[PDB]
Ligand binder design. Structure first.
Ligand SMILES: [Zn+2]
Ligand SMILES: [Zn+2]
Lengths: 436, 258
C-alpha cells in the first residue's frame, strides 16, 4: 500500500490533526498528482470559496477524467471541503488549518520545526556524511540478514516480533528462530525506499497495540523526511513515547545517535529517501549479470533468482538460467518483482539505452514465469446426470446464485462445482424432486 | 525522472525602478523580488527534482542571484537577497549607457542550461524553460544578438516566456512566438505573483491540459543595419540579405566582404 491508501481510511479528526504540522502538509502536497498541485497553488491565496463549475472549467473536456480523479482524491484526503455558497451554489475552499500550515511552510512564519541546535554548541563526537551512510548501510544489512536467518546478525526481541506480526517470518515454535516466508522474499526483492515505507506502515498499524499517538509519529516521520542531511536536531521537545519510537529508529539505521541520553541525533540518508542509488548490475543479452557489489546480502539476493559463476573481489558474474528462475518462482517470487529489482539495481551505463533492460531478457523471464501457471487444476465435483435441459438450467441457476459454480457447459449439460457447495446443491436438487 | 529547470530573468534596470519608486506607486522592486522568490519556491515545491535559477540584468552586466519555513528555501531566499543587495548597493552609474543588457542575461541562462544538461543522467531528460519579466523599455541596438539567442534557444527546444509589466517589447513577442513560449502583459502589477502562479507555473505538458490566454498580436518589424531602428518597408540585399532603410548604389556589407 501507498501513503494515499493509508490516509484514505483515517478519520477526519486524525487528518485534521495531521495538517497541524507544516511538514506533513508539504509531504501531502508533494504526494498529490500534477493537476492537484496546480489547483492547490491557485487556491492557496483565496479567502472565498469558488464554484464547482468554475473549477471544472479549468481543465479541458478531453482531460476531464484526470480532473475527476484529482477532485476525488482531494475530497478523500479532505484537503478542501465543499462550502454552501449562497443561492444554492456549492463553493470549494481549502481547509483553513491545512492552508495556514502550507503557507507557513512555504512563505514562512511561526516557530521552527526544531527547537535549537546552537544552544549546546558543536557536537564533541560528530560524524560525517560518509560515516552516516556507512552506518545506515550496515544497519540495513544486519536487519536483512536477520530476516534471512544468518547468526551473524542479531537484533532486539521487539524488532523480531514486529517482523512476525508483519507476516514476513513465522515462528512455528517458541525458542526456535522463525523461517522467512514467500512474503519475506517479496519484501527482500522490493526497492529500499519501498521496503522502508512498508516497514513504517506496518509500524504505524501495530502502534495501536502500544497505544502511541499516530499523529505525533506521522508528524515526526515527515519532519525527519525533510530534515537536512548532516545536521543534528534537538532531542528535547518530544514526548517520552516518541523518543522510545526514535530509539527503534536508531535500530533501523534511519537516525544515528551516540547514546540514548544524548540530546543530538543525525538523520541519515535512508530517512530522507523515505519521502521518495546509481545501480550496480550490468545485464547482457546472453543472460549474464555482472554486479559491482561485495556484501553478502546482494550476492544472496542475486543468487536467489540466478546461478552464480564467478566471484571476483569486486565483481560477481552470474548466469540467468531457466532452472534458476523456476526455482525462484517456486520460492514465491514473481517475474515482475525480479524485473523491477533488476531495473532498480541497473548500472548507470545501461541507462544510456532507451530501455533500461533489453526486451528479450524480460520477455524470456515472463514466459518462464507463465510455464508454472500453464496448467490449471480445480478440485471439485462434476454433475453429468441431467435428463432434461430445463432441470439442468434450474440447478445451474441455483449454483450461480450460491456462487459455488466452477465451470458450466450447457451444450453437453455438464457442470463442475466446489466440494463445499456440493452438499447445498444436492439438498436443493433433492427438494425439487421431492416437492414435485 | 521528469526534470524541470526554470530560469527567471529579472529586469533590474535602475532607472525604471527609480522612476517607479518616485511615483510612489503600490508596486516596487521589493515586491517584484518577493514575487519571484515565491514563484521559485512554488516551482521547487512542485517536484523534488525541479531546479531553479535566477539571473538579474543590469546596465553593467548580468548577476546570478542563485524559522517555520523550508530550510533549503530559506537558504535560497537568503542567497538571493544577499546577491540582489550586493548588486544594487555596488551599482554605480559610470557612463551614458541606459538600455538593459537583456541579451547577455539570456546568453548566460542558455549557457547555464547547457552546463546543467550534461550533468543530467542519461536516463532522464531535463526540460528547461526561461521566464523573463520586462520592466524598462526594449533595446533595438541588440536586435541581432537577441535573434541569435532566440535561434539558439529554438535549436535546443527551450521555452521562453515573457511577462511584460509596463512597456510591450516586440523582441519578447518574437521570442515567445518562435520558441512556443507564452507572452503576457500584466494589467495590475501588485497581482503579478498571482499570474506567475496561474499561467507560467505549470509546465509545457501541463499547459496543454489547462486553458491559457491566446497569444497577443506579435509584430515582426526588422531593424535597419545603418539605423538600428524598427522599420516596416526597406531595401534588402539579394546576396547577404542585409536590410537598409534607403536605397544605396553599393551594398555596404558586400563592399566589406572581399
Ligand atoms: Zn538604413
Ligand atoms: Zn549585400
Amino acid at each position: 500500500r501507498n501513503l494515499q491508501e493509508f490516509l484514505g481510511g483515517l478519520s477526519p479528526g486524525v487528518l485534521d490533526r495531521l495538517y497541524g504540522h507544516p511538514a506533513t502538509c508539504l509531504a501531502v502536497f508533494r504526494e498529490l498528482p500534477s493537476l492537484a498541485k496546480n489547483w492547490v497553488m491557485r487556491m492557496l491565496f483565496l479567502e472565498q470559496p469558488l464554484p464547482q463549475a468554475a473549477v471544472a472549467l479549468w481543465v479541458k473536456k478531453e482531460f476531464s477524467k484526470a480532473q475527476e480523479e484529482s477532485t476525488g482524491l482531494l475530497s478523500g484526503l479532505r484537503i478542501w471541503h465543499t462550502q454552501l455558497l449562497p443561492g444554492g451554489l456549492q463553493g470549494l475552499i481549502l481547509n483553513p488549518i491545512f492552508r495556514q500550515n502550507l503557507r507557513i511552510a512555504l512563505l514562512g512564519g511561526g516557530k521552527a520545526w526544531s527547537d535549537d541546535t546552537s544552544q549546546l554548541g558543536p557536537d564533541k563526537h560528530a560524524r560525517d556524511v560518509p560515516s552516516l551512510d556507512k552506518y545506515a548501510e550496515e544497519r540495513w544489512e544486519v536487519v536483512l540478514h536477520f530476516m534471512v536467518g544468518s547468526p551473524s546478525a542479531a537484533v532486539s526481541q521487539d524488532l523480531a516480533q514486529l517482523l512476525s506480526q508483519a507476516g514476513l517470518m513465522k515462528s512455528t515454535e517458541p525458542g526456535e528462530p522463525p523461517c522467512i516466508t514467500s512474503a519475506g522474499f517479496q519484501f527482500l526483492l522490493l526497492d529500499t525506499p519501498a521496503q522502508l515505507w512498508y516497514f513504517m506502515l506496518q509500524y504505524l498499524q501495530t502502534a495501536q497495540s502500544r497505544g502511541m499517538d499516530l499523529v505525533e509519529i506521522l508528524s515526526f516521520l515527515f519532519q525527519l523526511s525533510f530534515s537536512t542531511l548532516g545536521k543534528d536536531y534537538s532531542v528535547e521537545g518530544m514526548s517520552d513515547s516518541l523518543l522510545n519510537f526514535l530509539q527503534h529508529l536508531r535500530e533501523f539505521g534511519l537516525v544515528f545517535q551516540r547514546k540514548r541520553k544524548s540530546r543530538r541525533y543525525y538523520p541519515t540518508r535512508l530517512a530522507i529517501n523515505l519521502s521518495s542509488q546509481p545501480g550496480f548490475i550490468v545485464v547482457e543479452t546472453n543472460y549474464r549479470l555482472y554486479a559491482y557489489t561485495e556484501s553478502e546480502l546482494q550476492i544472496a539476493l542475486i543468487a536467489l533468482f540466478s546461478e552464480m559463476l564467478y566471484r571476483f573481489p569486486n565483481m560477481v558474474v552470474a548466469q540467468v538460467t531457466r532452472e534458476s528462475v523456476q526455482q525462484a518462482i517456486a520460492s514465491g517470487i514473481t517475474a515482475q518483482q525480479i524485473i523491477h529489482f533488476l531495473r532498480t539495481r541497473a548500472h548507470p551505463v545501461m541507462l544510456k539505452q532507451t530501455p533500461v533492460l533489453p526486451p528479450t531478457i524480460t520477455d524470456q523471464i515472463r514466459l518462464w514465469e507463465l510455464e508454472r501457471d500453464r496448467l490449471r487444476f480445480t478440485e471439485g465435483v462434476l454433475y453429468n446426470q441431467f435428463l432434461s435441459q430445463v432441470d439442468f438450467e434450474l440447478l445451474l441457476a441455483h449454483a450461480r446464485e450460491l456462487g459455488v459454480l466452477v465451470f458450466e457447459n450447457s451444450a453437453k449439460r455438464l457442470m463442475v462445482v466446489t466440494p463445499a457447495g456440493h452438499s447445498d446443491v444436492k439438498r436443493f436438487w433433492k427438494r425439487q424432486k421431492h416437492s414435485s | 525522472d521528469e526534470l524541470n529547470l526554470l530560469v527567471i530573468v529579472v529586469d533590474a534596470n535602475p532607472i525604471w525602478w527609480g522612476k517607479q519608486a518616485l511615483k510612489e506607486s503600490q508596486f516596487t522592486l521589493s515586491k517584484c523580488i518577493d514575487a519571484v522568490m515565491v514563484l521559485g519556491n512554488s516551482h521547487l515545491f512542485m517536484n523534488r527534482s525541479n531546479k531553479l535559477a535566477v539571473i538579474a540584468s543590469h546596465i553593467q552586466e548580468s548577476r546570478f542571484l542563485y524559522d517555520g519555513k523550508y530550510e533549503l528555501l530559506t537558504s535560497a531566499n537568503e542567497v538571493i537577497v544577499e546577491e540582489i543587495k550586493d548588486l544594487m548597493t555596488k551599482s554605480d552609474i559610470k557612463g551614458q549607457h541606459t538600455e538593459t543588457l537583456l541579451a547577455g542575461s539570456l546568453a548566460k541562462a542558455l549557457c547555464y542550461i547547457h552546463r546543467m544538461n550534461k550533468e543530467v543522467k542519461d536516463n532522464q531528460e531535463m526540460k528547461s524553460r526561461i521566464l523573463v519579466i520586462k520592466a524598462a523599455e526594449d533595446s533595438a541596438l541588440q536586435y541581432m544578438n537577441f535573434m541569435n539567442v532566440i535561434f539558439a534557444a529554438q535549436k535546443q527546444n527551450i521555452l521562453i516566456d515573457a511577462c511584460v509589466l509596463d512597456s510591450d517589447s516586440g523582441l519578447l513577442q518574437q521570442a515567445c512566438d518562435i520558441t512556443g513560449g507564452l507572452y503576457l502583459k500584466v494589467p495590475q502589477m501588485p497581482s503579478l505573483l498571482q499570474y506567475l502562479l496561474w499561467v507560467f507555473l505549470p509546465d509545457q505538458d501541463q499547459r496543454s491540459q489547462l486553458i491559457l490566454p491566446p497569444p497577443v498580436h506579435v509584430d515582426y518589424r526588422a531593424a535597419c543595419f545603418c539605423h538600428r531602428n524598427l522599420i516596416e518597408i526597406g531595401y534588402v540585399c539579394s546576396v547577404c540579405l542585409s536590410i537598409f532603410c534607403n536605397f544605396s548604389p553599393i551594398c555596404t556589407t558586400c563592399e566589406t566582404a572581399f
